[PDB]
Amino acid sequence: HMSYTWTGALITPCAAEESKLPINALSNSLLRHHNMVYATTSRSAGLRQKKVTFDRLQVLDDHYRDVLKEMKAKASTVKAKLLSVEEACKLTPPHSAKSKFGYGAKDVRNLSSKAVNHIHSVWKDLLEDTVTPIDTTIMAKNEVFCVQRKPARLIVFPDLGVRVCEKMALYDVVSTLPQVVMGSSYGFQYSPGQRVEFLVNTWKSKKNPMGFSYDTRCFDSTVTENDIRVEESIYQCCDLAPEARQAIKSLTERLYIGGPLTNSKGQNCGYRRCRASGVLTTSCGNTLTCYLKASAACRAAKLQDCTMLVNGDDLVVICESAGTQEDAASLRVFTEAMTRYSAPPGDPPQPEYDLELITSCSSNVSVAHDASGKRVYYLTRDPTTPLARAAWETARHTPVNSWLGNIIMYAPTLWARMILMTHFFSILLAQEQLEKALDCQIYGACYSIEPLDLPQIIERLHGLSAFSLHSYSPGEINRVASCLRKLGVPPLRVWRHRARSVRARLLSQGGRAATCGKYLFNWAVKTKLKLTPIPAASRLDLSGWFVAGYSGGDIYH
Ligand SMILES: CCC(C)(C)[C@H]1C(O)=C(C2=CS(=O)(=O)c3cc(NS(C)(=O)=O)ccc3N2)C(=O)N1Cc1ccc(F)c(C)c1
């Protein structure tokens, strides 16, 4: 029952990997402690292999089967459709990994005969053969962090042809089934403004609230053959075309439950018997499995008025407190149940009696005040990793612009507004790239976004108050200041100064640019402009935003 077996062949790169922060003329204006920032490489892959390789044991009781029966009954109400080849081709990111079979993602998107013909052949094979393990490639992710040094995370994914077939069989299912099965507990249905409302409303609904986050140790490696067969039994409760059923069964037996791991040089690295990080069903499978195990563990622990919020492997629970000693004992029971279900913790969970000290999806609730002095809740995080990734992106073009996803999702925060907005609008002005669309990821899917659309995007995701917040909390302010000292980032007084310049430049461009100057940087001037609802906000097509999660899913929206 091991998560992986290995041959000793190395996990190899496909191009040169940099680990040191690249430096250019713009670097010092953001961050001086360059030696604090690094990127992960295949050189640490071996250390990750060791961490992710362990035996799983799993004891399944009546609570587990009781929840699973309920989830199944809800899933039975879902009707899901097959996508056409052309619809699935349109969901492929332009820069997705090319096929081993002589075509690329651009050929897929174009519906080129070589690509479409091969995809039809993979589909036929999937319908005919429900036994043969499907090949996957294993690679080390290159991700940027601040020291305090993580080994590379691994990514495991099938060929591009197979990925298009996954979409055809399962895109509609994984996009629709989780919210039906899980209701308000499915986290990927929420925009940031919706997510903070749900946490606060939930917290407020309890007489004496308690909450905690649950950190599963290497969630993907804890997912067993049982878990993945249970996921398929849930998918199969849906009302589906017979062709879709056969494809889902085949994909489950041949790809999702396990298969051979091949490096970038074509050598066999070993064999996987746990979740693949780079398949379409990674997010939905992890969310269903986490929810099943956590709901059952809640019943085992006798938690009172229990609300869960689940985004894949990310779990928070808010419930009724029963006193500090019994809460501590209940959380032990919960952790023991989870452990018996094959989901033991990394960090053991702690009860918290302050909403603002709970982290979920790498974020906590904090409070600031709008133009009328009215309290507004918003989600924030420690800015260290966002700012390290921004320093890197200041000197290197990358396929995903973390800075842009961070402005979008953390737009209300003092650090996104003062540092990220200022710094990157400066760069776009100087380079005359204000109109250039950039790719970034939200809930695992890729979006191409125009930075001049940012004000309307932010009004939709957060409301107009995102542009007037002030009087942020002392905890939040100190956590930012602490980060700036650590990374060597100029203090906020300098940022306010630069923001005025940036704002004046943007207003001097007219049009969409001036709207960015007006809304995004109203905080930097004492003589304020009046900020009214933006007409363009009402016409923005944000469909496909905040419907589901697609981590590893190879989705472009
Ligand atoms: C720029 C996007 C950002 C900030 C990273 C953004 C984002 O996209 C993810 C995010 C992306 S994801 O890849 O779908 C994913 C996968 C898994 N686990 S798994 C592998 O099992 O699916 C767990 C969590 C998760 N969350 C995230 O948590 N963000 C923070 C965040 C989230 C919600 C929110 F309201 C605010 C304000 C900020």
Coordinates of C-alpha atoms and ligand atoms in Angstrom, one line a residue:
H1 CA 0.0 0.0 0.0
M2 CA 2.8 2.5 -0.7
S3 CA 2.0 5.9 -2.3
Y4 CA 4.9 5.5 -4.7
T5 CA 7.6 3.0 -5.8
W6 CA 10.8 4.2 -7.5
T7 CA 13.5 2.8 -9.8
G8 CA 16.3 5.3 -8.9
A9 CA 16.0 7.1 -12.3
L10 CA 16.2 10.8 -11.6
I11 CA 13.4 13.4 -12.0
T12 CA 14.9 15.5 -14.7
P13 CA 14.4 19.1 -16.0
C14 CA 13.6 20.0 -19.6
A15 CA 15.3 23.5 -19.6
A16 CA 17.8 25.4 -17.5
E17 CA 16.6 26.1 -13.9
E18 CA 17.6 29.2 -12.0
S19 CA 17.5 29.2 -8.2
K20 CA 19.0 32.6 -7.5
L21 CA 16.8 35.7 -7.8
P22 CA 17.5 37.3 -11.1
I23 CA 18.4 41.0 -10.7
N24 CA 17.8 44.0 -13.0
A25 CA 17.7 47.8 -12.8
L26 CA 14.2 47.6 -11.2
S27 CA 14.9 45.1 -8.5
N28 CA 16.2 47.3 -5.7
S29 CA 13.2 49.6 -5.9
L30 CA 11.1 46.6 -4.6
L31 CA 13.4 44.5 -2.5
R32 CA 17.1 44.7 -1.3
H33 CA 17.6 41.3 0.4
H34 CA 18.0 39.3 -2.8
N35 CA 19.7 36.5 -1.0
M36 CA 16.4 35.7 0.8
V37 CA 14.5 34.8 -2.4
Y38 CA 15.0 31.5 -4.3
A39 CA 13.3 29.1 -6.6
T40 CA 12.9 25.3 -6.3
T41 CA 14.5 23.0 -8.8
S42 CA 14.8 19.3 -9.7
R43 CA 18.1 19.3 -7.7
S44 CA 15.8 18.9 -4.6
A45 CA 13.4 16.4 -6.2
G46 CA 15.0 13.5 -4.4
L47 CA 14.1 15.1 -1.0
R48 CA 10.5 15.5 -2.2
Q49 CA 10.3 11.8 -3.3
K50 CA 11.2 10.8 0.3
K51 CA 8.6 13.0 1.9
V52 CA 5.7 11.9 -0.4
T53 CA 6.5 8.1 -0.2
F54 CA 4.8 6.3 2.7
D55 CA 2.4 3.4 3.5
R56 CA -1.3 4.2 3.8
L57 CA -3.6 2.4 6.1
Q58 CA -7.4 2.9 6.0
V59 CA -10.2 1.8 8.4
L60 CA -13.7 2.7 7.2
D61 CA -16.6 2.8 9.7
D62 CA -20.3 3.6 9.7
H63 CA -19.9 7.4 9.8
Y64 CA -17.9 7.2 6.5
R65 CA -20.5 5.1 4.8
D66 CA -23.4 7.2 6.2
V67 CA -21.9 10.5 4.7
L68 CA -21.0 8.7 1.4
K69 CA -24.6 7.5 1.0
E70 CA -25.8 11.1 1.4
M71 CA -23.2 12.5 -1.1
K72 CA -24.3 9.8 -3.6
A73 CA -28.0 10.7 -3.2
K74 CA -27.2 14.4 -4.0
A75 CA -24.9 13.4 -6.9
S76 CA -27.8 11.4 -8.4
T77 CA -29.6 14.7 -9.1
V78 CA -26.7 15.9 -11.4
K79 CA -27.1 15.6 -15.1
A80 CA -23.8 16.2 -16.9
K81 CA -22.9 16.5 -20.6
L82 CA -20.1 15.3 -22.9
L83 CA -18.1 18.2 -24.3
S84 CA -17.4 18.1 -28.1
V85 CA -13.8 17.8 -29.3
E86 CA -13.9 21.5 -30.2
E87 CA -15.2 22.6 -26.8
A88 CA -12.4 20.7 -25.0
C89 CA -9.8 22.0 -27.5
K90 CA -10.9 25.6 -26.6
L91 CA -10.3 24.9 -22.8
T92 CA -6.6 24.0 -23.5
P93 CA -4.1 26.8 -22.4
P94 CA -2.1 28.1 -25.5
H95 CA 1.1 27.1 -23.7
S96 CA 0.1 23.7 -22.3
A97 CA 2.8 20.9 -22.7
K98 CA 3.0 19.6 -26.2
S99 CA 2.0 16.0 -27.2
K100 CA 4.7 13.3 -27.6
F101 CA 2.7 12.6 -30.8
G102 CA 3.7 15.5 -33.0
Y103 CA 1.4 18.4 -32.1
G104 CA 1.2 21.2 -29.6
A105 CA -1.5 23.1 -27.6
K106 CA -1.7 25.8 -30.4
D107 CA -2.5 23.0 -32.9
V108 CA -5.2 21.7 -30.5
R109 CA -6.8 25.2 -30.1
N110 CA -6.7 25.5 -33.9
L111 CA -8.4 22.1 -34.4
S112 CA -5.6 21.0 -36.7
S113 CA -6.3 17.6 -38.4
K114 CA -3.2 15.9 -36.8
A115 CA -4.4 17.0 -33.3
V116 CA -8.1 16.2 -33.7
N117 CA -7.4 12.8 -35.4
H118 CA -5.1 11.8 -32.6
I119 CA -7.6 12.9 -29.9
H120 CA -10.3 10.8 -31.6
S121 CA -7.9 7.8 -31.4
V122 CA -7.2 8.3 -27.7
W123 CA -11.0 8.5 -27.1
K124 CA -11.6 5.2 -29.0
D125 CA -8.8 3.5 -27.1
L126 CA -10.3 4.8 -23.8
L127 CA -13.7 3.3 -24.8
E128 CA -12.1 -0.1 -25.8
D129 CA -9.5 -0.6 -23.1
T130 CA -10.3 -0.2 -19.4
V131 CA -7.2 -2.0 -18.0
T132 CA -3.9 -0.7 -19.5
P133 CA -2.1 1.9 -17.2
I134 CA -1.7 5.3 -19.0
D135 CA 1.7 6.8 -19.2
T136 CA 2.5 10.0 -17.2
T137 CA 5.3 12.5 -16.9
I138 CA 6.8 13.5 -13.6
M139 CA 8.6 16.8 -13.2
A140 CA 9.8 19.2 -10.4
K141 CA 7.8 22.5 -10.1
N142 CA 9.9 25.7 -10.1
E143 CA 8.3 27.9 -7.5
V144 CA 9.6 31.0 -5.7
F145 CA 9.8 31.5 -1.9
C146 CA 11.4 33.4 0.8
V147 CA 13.9 31.4 3.0
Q148 CA 12.4 30.0 6.2
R149 CA 14.4 25.6 2.0
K150 CA 11.5 23.8 0.5
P151 CA 12.2 21.0 -1.9
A152 CA 10.5 21.1 -5.3
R153 CA 6.9 20.0 -5.4
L154 CA 6.2 17.3 -8.0
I155 CA 3.7 17.5 -10.9
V156 CA 2.4 14.3 -12.5
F157 CA 0.4 14.5 -15.8
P158 CA -0.7 12.5 -18.8
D159 CA -0.2 13.3 -22.5
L160 CA -2.0 16.3 -24.1
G161 CA -4.3 14.0 -26.1
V162 CA -5.4 12.4 -22.9
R163 CA -5.9 15.8 -21.2
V164 CA -8.4 16.8 -24.0
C165 CA -10.3 13.5 -23.5
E166 CA -10.5 14.1 -19.7
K167 CA -12.3 17.4 -20.5
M168 CA -14.7 15.7 -22.9
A169 CA -15.7 13.0 -20.3
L170 CA -15.5 15.1 -17.1
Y171 CA -15.3 18.9 -17.5
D172 CA -19.0 19.4 -17.0
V173 CA -19.1 16.9 -14.0
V174 CA -16.1 18.5 -12.1
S175 CA -17.5 22.0 -12.7
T176 CA -21.1 21.2 -11.5
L177 CA -21.1 18.1 -9.1
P178 CA -19.2 19.5 -6.2
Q179 CA -21.6 22.4 -5.4
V180 CA -24.6 20.0 -5.6
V181 CA -23.0 17.4 -3.3
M182 CA -21.6 19.9 -0.8
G183 CA -23.8 23.1 -1.1
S184 CA -22.4 26.2 0.7
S185 CA -19.4 24.2 1.9
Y186 CA -18.0 24.0 -1.6
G187 CA -15.4 26.9 -1.5
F188 CA -14.5 27.3 -5.2
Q189 CA -18.0 28.8 -5.9
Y190 CA -17.1 32.0 -4.0
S191 CA -15.4 35.3 -5.1
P192 CA -13.3 36.9 -2.4
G193 CA -16.2 39.1 -1.2
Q194 CA -18.5 36.1 -1.1
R195 CA -15.9 34.0 0.8
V196 CA -15.4 36.6 3.5
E197 CA -19.1 37.0 3.9
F198 CA -19.6 33.3 4.3
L199 CA -16.9 32.9 7.0
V200 CA -18.2 36.0 9.0
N201 CA -21.8 35.0 8.7
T202 CA -21.0 31.4 9.7
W203 CA -18.9 32.6 12.6
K204 CA -21.7 35.0 13.7
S205 CA -24.3 32.2 13.4
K206 CA -22.8 30.4 16.4
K207 CA -23.5 31.3 20.1
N208 CA -19.9 30.7 21.2
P209 CA -17.9 30.1 18.0
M210 CA -14.8 27.9 17.7
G211 CA -12.9 27.1 14.6
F212 CA -9.8 25.4 13.2
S213 CA -8.0 24.6 10.0
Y214 CA -6.9 21.0 9.2
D215 CA -3.5 20.5 7.6
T216 CA -3.3 17.0 6.0
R217 CA 0.3 15.9 5.6
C218 CA 0.9 15.5 1.8
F219 CA -2.8 15.1 1.0
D220 CA -2.2 13.7 -2.6
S221 CA 0.0 10.9 -1.2
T222 CA -2.7 10.0 1.4
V223 CA -5.4 9.4 -1.3
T224 CA -5.8 5.6 -1.7
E225 CA -7.1 3.3 -4.4
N226 CA -10.3 3.1 -2.3
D227 CA -10.7 6.9 -2.2
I228 CA -10.3 7.1 -6.0
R229 CA -12.8 4.3 -6.7
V230 CA -15.2 6.0 -4.3
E231 CA -14.8 9.2 -6.4
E232 CA -15.7 7.3 -9.5
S233 CA -18.8 5.8 -7.8
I234 CA -19.9 9.4 -7.1
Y235 CA -19.3 10.5 -10.7
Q236 CA -21.3 7.5 -11.9
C237 CA -24.4 8.6 -9.8
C238 CA -24.8 11.5 -12.3
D239 CA -27.1 11.2 -15.2
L240 CA -24.5 10.7 -18.0
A241 CA -24.2 9.5 -21.6
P242 CA -23.2 5.9 -21.8
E243 CA -20.0 7.0 -23.7
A244 CA -19.2 9.3 -20.8
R245 CA -19.7 6.4 -18.3
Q246 CA -17.3 4.2 -20.2
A247 CA -14.7 6.9 -20.4
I248 CA -14.9 7.8 -16.7
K249 CA -14.5 4.1 -15.8
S250 CA -11.5 3.7 -18.1
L251 CA -9.8 6.9 -17.0
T252 CA -10.3 5.8 -13.4
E253 CA -8.7 2.3 -13.9
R254 CA -6.0 3.4 -16.2
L255 CA -5.0 6.9 -15.0
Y256 CA -6.6 8.2 -11.8
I257 CA -5.9 5.2 -9.5
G258 CA -2.3 4.9 -10.6
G259 CA 0.3 4.4 -13.3
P260 CA 3.9 4.6 -14.4
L261 CA 6.0 7.8 -13.9
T262 CA 8.3 8.8 -16.8
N263 CA 10.9 11.6 -16.6
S264 CA 11.5 14.2 -19.3
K265 CA 14.2 12.0 -20.8
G266 CA 11.8 9.1 -21.3
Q267 CA 13.1 6.9 -18.5
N268 CA 10.9 5.1 -16.0
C269 CA 11.1 6.7 -12.6
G270 CA 8.6 4.4 -10.9
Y271 CA 5.0 3.9 -10.1
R272 CA 2.2 6.0 -8.5
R273 CA -0.7 4.5 -6.4
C274 CA -2.1 7.9 -5.1
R275 CA -3.5 11.1 -6.5
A276 CA -1.9 12.6 -9.6
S277 CA -1.4 16.3 -9.2
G278 CA -1.8 17.0 -12.9
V279 CA -5.2 15.6 -13.9
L280 CA -8.6 17.3 -14.5
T281 CA -10.2 15.5 -11.4
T282 CA -7.4 16.5 -8.9
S283 CA -9.5 19.4 -7.4
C284 CA -12.9 17.8 -7.4
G285 CA -11.5 14.4 -6.2
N286 CA -9.5 16.0 -3.4
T287 CA -12.6 18.2 -2.4
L288 CA -15.0 15.3 -2.4
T289 CA -12.5 13.1 -0.5
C290 CA -11.6 15.8 2.1
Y291 CA -15.3 16.6 2.6
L292 CA -16.3 12.9 3.1
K293 CA -13.5 12.2 5.5
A294 CA -14.0 15.5 7.5
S295 CA -17.8 15.2 7.7
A296 CA -17.5 11.7 9.0
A297 CA -14.7 12.7 11.4
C298 CA -17.0 15.6 12.7
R299 CA -19.7 13.1 13.6
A300 CA -17.1 10.8 15.3
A301 CA -15.9 13.9 17.4
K302 CA -19.5 14.9 18.2
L303 CA -18.8 18.5 17.1
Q304 CA -21.8 20.8 17.5
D305 CA -23.4 22.9 14.8
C306 CA -20.5 22.1 12.5
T307 CA -20.0 24.2 9.3
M308 CA -17.2 23.1 6.9
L309 CA -15.6 25.1 4.1
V310 CA -13.5 23.0 1.7
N311 CA -11.3 23.9 -1.3
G312 CA -9.7 20.7 -2.4
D313 CA -7.3 19.6 0.4
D314 CA -7.8 22.9 2.3
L315 CA -10.2 22.5 5.3
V316 CA -11.7 24.8 7.8
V317 CA -14.4 24.0 10.3
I318 CA -16.4 26.5 12.5
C319 CA -18.6 25.0 15.2
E320 CA -20.3 25.6 18.6
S321 CA -17.8 25.7 21.4
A322 CA -18.4 23.4 24.4
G323 CA -15.7 25.0 26.6
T324 CA -11.9 25.1 26.0
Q325 CA -11.2 21.6 27.5
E326 CA -13.9 19.7 25.7
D327 CA -13.0 21.5 22.4
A328 CA -9.4 20.3 22.8
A329 CA -10.6 16.8 23.4
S330 CA -13.1 16.9 20.4
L331 CA -10.2 18.0 18.1
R332 CA -8.2 15.0 19.2
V333 CA -11.1 12.7 18.3
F334 CA -11.4 14.5 14.9
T335 CA -7.7 14.1 14.2
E336 CA -7.8 10.4 15.2
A337 CA -10.8 9.8 12.9
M338 CA -9.1 11.6 10.0
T339 CA -5.9 9.5 10.7
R340 CA -7.9 6.2 10.5
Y341 CA -9.3 7.4 7.2
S342 CA -5.8 8.0 5.7
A343 CA -5.5 11.7 6.3
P344 CA -3.2 12.4 9.3
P345 CA -2.1 16.0 10.0
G346 CA 1.2 17.7 9.5
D347 CA 0.6 20.5 12.0
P348 CA -1.9 19.2 14.6
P349 CA -5.1 21.3 14.6
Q350 CA -5.7 24.0 17.3
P351 CA -9.0 25.5 18.4
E352 CA -9.3 29.3 17.8
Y353 CA -11.8 31.6 19.3
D354 CA -10.9 34.6 17.1
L355 CA -11.9 34.5 13.4
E356 CA -8.9 36.7 12.6
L357 CA -6.3 34.1 13.7
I358 CA -7.7 31.2 11.5
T359 CA -5.8 30.7 8.2
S360 CA -7.7 29.0 5.3
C361 CA -6.7 29.1 1.6
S362 CA -3.5 30.8 3.0
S363 CA -5.7 33.7 4.2
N364 CA -7.2 35.3 7.4
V365 CA -10.1 37.6 8.1
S366 CA -9.2 41.2 9.1
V367 CA -11.0 44.5 9.5
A368 CA -10.8 48.0 8.0
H369 CA -13.2 50.9 7.5
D370 CA -14.9 52.4 4.4
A371 CA -15.5 56.1 3.4
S372 CA -18.4 56.3 5.9
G373 CA -16.4 54.8 8.8
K374 CA -18.4 51.6 8.5
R375 CA -16.5 48.4 9.4
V376 CA -15.6 46.1 6.5
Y377 CA -14.2 42.6 6.7
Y378 CA -11.7 41.4 4.1
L379 CA -9.2 38.6 3.5
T380 CA -5.5 39.1 3.7
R381 CA -2.3 37.1 4.2
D382 CA 1.4 37.5 5.2
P383 CA 2.9 39.3 2.1
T384 CA 6.3 37.6 2.1
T385 CA 5.6 35.0 -0.6
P386 CA 3.6 37.4 -2.8
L387 CA 6.5 39.9 -2.6
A388 CA 9.2 37.4 -3.3
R389 CA 7.3 36.3 -6.4
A390 CA 6.9 39.9 -7.5
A391 CA 10.6 40.6 -7.1
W392 CA 11.3 37.6 -9.4
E393 CA 8.6 38.8 -11.9
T394 CA 10.2 42.3 -11.9
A395 CA 13.3 40.8 -13.6
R396 CA 11.9 37.7 -15.4
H397 CA 8.9 37.1 -17.7
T398 CA 7.0 34.1 -16.4
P399 CA 4.0 32.1 -17.8
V400 CA 1.8 33.0 -14.9
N401 CA 1.9 36.5 -13.4
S402 CA 1.4 35.9 -9.6
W403 CA 1.5 39.7 -9.1
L404 CA -1.7 40.1 -11.1
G405 CA -3.6 37.2 -9.4
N406 CA -2.5 38.8 -6.1
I407 CA -3.8 42.3 -6.9
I408 CA -7.1 40.7 -8.1
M409 CA -7.7 38.5 -5.1
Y410 CA -6.1 40.7 -2.4
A411 CA -7.2 44.1 -3.8
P412 CA -8.7 45.4 -0.5
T413 CA -5.4 44.7 1.4
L414 CA -3.0 47.6 2.3
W415 CA 0.0 45.7 0.8
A416 CA -1.6 44.9 -2.6
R417 CA -2.7 48.5 -3.0
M418 CA 0.4 50.3 -1.7
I419 CA 3.1 48.0 -3.1
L420 CA 1.9 45.6 -5.8
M421 CA -0.4 48.2 -7.7
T422 CA 2.2 51.0 -7.4
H423 CA 5.2 48.9 -8.4
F424 CA 3.6 47.1 -11.4
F425 CA 1.6 50.1 -12.8
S426 CA 4.9 52.0 -12.7
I427 CA 6.5 49.3 -14.8
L428 CA 3.6 49.0 -17.3
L429 CA 3.6 52.9 -17.8
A430 CA 7.4 53.1 -18.4
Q431 CA 7.2 50.1 -20.8
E432 CA 4.0 51.3 -22.5
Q433 CA 2.3 47.8 -21.9
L434 CA -0.9 49.0 -20.1
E435 CA -3.0 47.4 -22.9
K436 CA -1.2 44.1 -23.1
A437 CA -3.2 41.1 -21.8
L438 CA -1.3 38.9 -19.2
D439 CA -2.0 35.3 -18.1
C440 CA -2.6 34.5 -14.4
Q441 CA -4.2 31.7 -12.4
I442 CA -7.3 31.8 -10.1
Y443 CA -8.6 28.6 -8.5
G444 CA -6.2 26.7 -10.8
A445 CA -7.6 27.9 -14.1
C446 CA -5.7 30.2 -16.5
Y447 CA -7.2 33.6 -17.4
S448 CA -5.9 36.2 -19.8
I449 CA -6.5 39.6 -18.2
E450 CA -6.1 43.2 -19.3
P451 CA -4.6 45.2 -16.4
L452 CA -6.7 48.3 -17.5
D453 CA -9.8 46.2 -16.6
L454 CA -8.6 45.9 -13.0
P455 CA -10.9 48.6 -11.5
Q456 CA -14.1 46.8 -12.8
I457 CA -12.8 43.4 -11.9
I458 CA -12.1 44.6 -8.3
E459 CA -15.5 46.3 -8.0
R460 CA -17.2 43.0 -9.0
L461 CA -15.1 40.7 -6.8
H462 CA -14.9 43.0 -3.7
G463 CA -17.3 46.0 -4.1
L464 CA -16.4 49.8 -4.4
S465 CA -15.3 49.8 -0.8
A466 CA -12.0 48.1 -1.9
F467 CA -11.0 51.5 -3.2
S468 CA -11.7 53.5 0.1
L469 CA -10.5 51.2 3.0
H470 CA -8.5 52.8 5.7
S471 CA -7.7 52.4 9.4
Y472 CA -6.5 48.9 8.9
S473 CA -5.9 46.9 12.1
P474 CA -2.6 47.2 14.2
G475 CA -2.0 43.4 13.8
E476 CA -2.2 43.6 10.0
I477 CA -0.1 46.8 9.8
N478 CA 2.6 45.2 12.0
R479 CA 2.7 42.0 10.0
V480 CA 3.2 44.0 6.8
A481 CA 6.0 46.2 8.3
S482 CA 7.7 43.1 9.6
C483 CA 7.8 41.6 6.1
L484 CA 9.2 44.8 4.6
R485 CA 12.1 44.9 7.1
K486 CA 12.8 41.1 6.5
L487 CA 12.9 41.4 2.7
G488 CA 14.4 44.9 2.6
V489 CA 11.4 46.6 1.0
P490 CA 11.1 50.4 1.2
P491 CA 8.6 51.6 3.9
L492 CA 5.0 52.6 3.1
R493 CA 5.7 56.3 3.2
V494 CA 8.0 55.8 0.1
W495 CA 5.2 53.7 -1.6
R496 CA 2.6 56.5 -0.9
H497 CA 5.0 58.9 -2.6
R498 CA 5.5 56.8 -5.7
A499 CA 1.8 56.1 -5.9
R500 CA 1.1 59.8 -6.4
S501 CA 3.5 59.9 -9.3
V502 CA 2.0 56.7 -10.7
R503 CA -1.5 58.1 -10.3
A504 CA -0.7 61.4 -11.9
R505 CA 0.9 59.5 -14.9
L506 CA -2.2 57.3 -15.3
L507 CA -4.6 60.2 -15.1
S508 CA -2.5 62.0 -17.8
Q509 CA -3.1 59.0 -20.2
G510 CA -6.9 59.5 -20.2
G511 CA -9.4 56.8 -20.7
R512 CA -9.1 53.3 -19.1
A513 CA -5.7 54.3 -17.8
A514 CA -7.1 57.4 -16.0
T515 CA -9.8 55.2 -14.5
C516 CA -7.0 53.0 -13.0
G517 CA -5.4 56.3 -11.7
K518 CA -8.8 57.4 -10.3
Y519 CA -9.9 54.2 -8.5
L520 CA -6.8 52.2 -7.8
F521 CA -4.8 55.1 -6.2
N522 CA -7.4 57.4 -4.5
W523 CA -5.8 56.3 -1.2
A524 CA -2.6 58.1 -2.0
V525 CA -4.1 61.7 -2.1
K526 CA -5.8 63.7 0.6
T527 CA -8.0 65.6 -1.8
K528 CA -10.1 62.6 -2.9
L529 CA -12.1 62.0 -6.1
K530 CA -15.6 60.7 -5.8
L531 CA -15.7 57.0 -6.7
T532 CA -19.0 55.9 -8.4
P533 CA -20.1 52.5 -9.7
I534 CA -18.1 51.8 -13.0
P535 CA -20.5 51.2 -16.0
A536 CA -18.1 48.6 -17.5
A537 CA -18.3 46.5 -14.3
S538 CA -21.9 45.6 -15.1
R539 CA -20.9 44.2 -18.6
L540 CA -17.8 42.2 -17.6
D541 CA -18.3 38.6 -18.4
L542 CA -17.1 36.9 -15.2
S543 CA -18.8 33.6 -16.1
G544 CA -16.4 30.7 -15.5
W545 CA -14.9 32.8 -12.6
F546 CA -15.7 31.2 -9.2
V547 CA -17.5 28.1 -10.4
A548 CA -15.0 25.4 -9.6
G549 CA -11.4 24.6 -8.8
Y550 CA -9.0 23.2 -11.5
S551 CA -5.6 22.8 -9.9
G552 CA -3.5 20.6 -12.2
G553 CA -6.5 20.6 -14.5
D554 CA -5.0 22.2 -17.6
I555 CA -7.9 24.7 -17.9
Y556 CA -8.0 28.0 -19.8
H557 CA -11.0 30.3 -19.3
Ligands
LIG1 C1 -4.1 34.5 -7.2 C2 -4.8 33.2 -6.8 C3 -4.6 32.9 -5.3 C4 -4.2 34.2 -4.5 C5 -3.3 32.0 -5.2 C6 -5.9 32.2 -4.8 C7 -6.1 30.9 -5.5 O1 -6.2 30.7 -6.9 C8 -6.1 29.9 -4.6 C9 -6.3 28.4 -4.9 C10 -6.0 27.9 -6.1 S1 -6.2 26.2 -6.4 O2 -5.0 25.8 -7.2 O3 -7.5 25.9 -7.0 C11 -6.2 25.5 -4.8 C12 -6.0 24.1 -4.7 C13 -6.0 23.5 -3.4 N1 -5.8 22.1 -3.3 S2 -6.1 20.9 -4.5 C14 -4.5 20.7 -5.3 O4 -6.4 19.7 -3.7 O5 -7.0 21.5 -5.4 C15 -6.3 24.2 -2.3 C16 -6.5 25.6 -2.4 C17 -6.5 26.2 -3.7 N2 -6.7 27.6 -3.8 C18 -6.0 30.4 -3.3 O6 -6.0 29.7 -2.3 N3 -5.8 31.8 -3.4 C19 -5.8 32.6 -2.2 C20 -7.2 33.1 -2.0 C21 -8.3 32.2 -2.1 C22 -9.6 32.7 -1.9 C23 -9.9 34.0 -1.6 F1 -11.2 34.4 -1.5 C24 -8.8 34.9 -1.5 C25 -9.1 36.3 -1.2 C26 -7.5 34.4 -1.7

